[PDB]
């Protein structure tokens, strides 16, 4: 689809059988989702942006469905203000910025 | 053009006689730039990131050239780790996400 930007680019994603609303963020290297338990081992990590750092749990090779498009990659879980889909998964679904 | 996301989407922007590299950020409601004096009245504002909030100065009706595309709007100035072009200006140059 084509998403305009007059409103925040929020889409529905499916992960671990649960539906969640997430922001398509070209300004994020990685994908960060709100606190939730996911299967598989995880490693502690620290990521940052405006305001400073936060501690997250890194899960690898996690299948995520974005607007019907499948992706399998790294997902960070932590106290983020909104679910964020970063470039690591945006590239997998073939997302581009155009103008 | 069509910008792929294998790498951070940085572009050159022009403000007055000033050149700066800025990130085309669909995950940002507003545009914030790193230290640079702008003309006119400015109002204090608080904006939120992944780790908390920072204080910035809000300047309105600022002409900004993005990749040969003219845009005019609110520009925030504060301690952002990266110059950011937010949705307020991305909409003016007809920028969309596509997949």
């Amino acid at each position: 689809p084509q998403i305009t930007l007059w409103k925040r680019p929020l889409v529905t994603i499916r992960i671990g059988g649960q539906l969640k609303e997430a922001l398509l963020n070209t300004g994020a290297d990685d994908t960060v989702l709100e606190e939730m338990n996911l299967p598989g081992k995880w490693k502690p990590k620290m990521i940052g942006g405006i305001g400073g750092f936060i501690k997250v749990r890194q899960y690898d090779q996690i299948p995520v469905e974005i607007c019907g498009h499948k992706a399998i990659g790294t997902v960070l879980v932590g106290p983020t203000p909104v679910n964020i889909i970063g470039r690591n998964l945006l590239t997998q679904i073939g997302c581009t910025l155009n103008f | 053009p069509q910008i792929t996301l294998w790498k951070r989407p940085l572009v050159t922007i022009r403000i007055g006689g000033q050149l700066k590299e800025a990130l085309l950020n669909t995950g940002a409601d507003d545009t914030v730039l790193e230290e640079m004096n702008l003309p006119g009245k400015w109002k204090p504002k608080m904006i939120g990131g992944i780790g908390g909030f920072i204080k910035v100065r809000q300047y309105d009706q600022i002409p900004v050239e993005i990749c040969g595309h003219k845009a005019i709007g609110t520009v925030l100035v504060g301690p952002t780790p990266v110059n950011i072009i937010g949705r307020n200006l991305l909409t003016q140059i007809g920028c969309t996400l596509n997949f």
């Binding site: 940052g48 | 904006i47 990131g49």
Partner: peptide
């Protein structure tokens, strides 16, 4: 520090 640049304008 510049990896996740979400920015809330409110």
């Amino acid at each position: 520090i510049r990896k996740i640049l979400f920015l809330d304008g409110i």
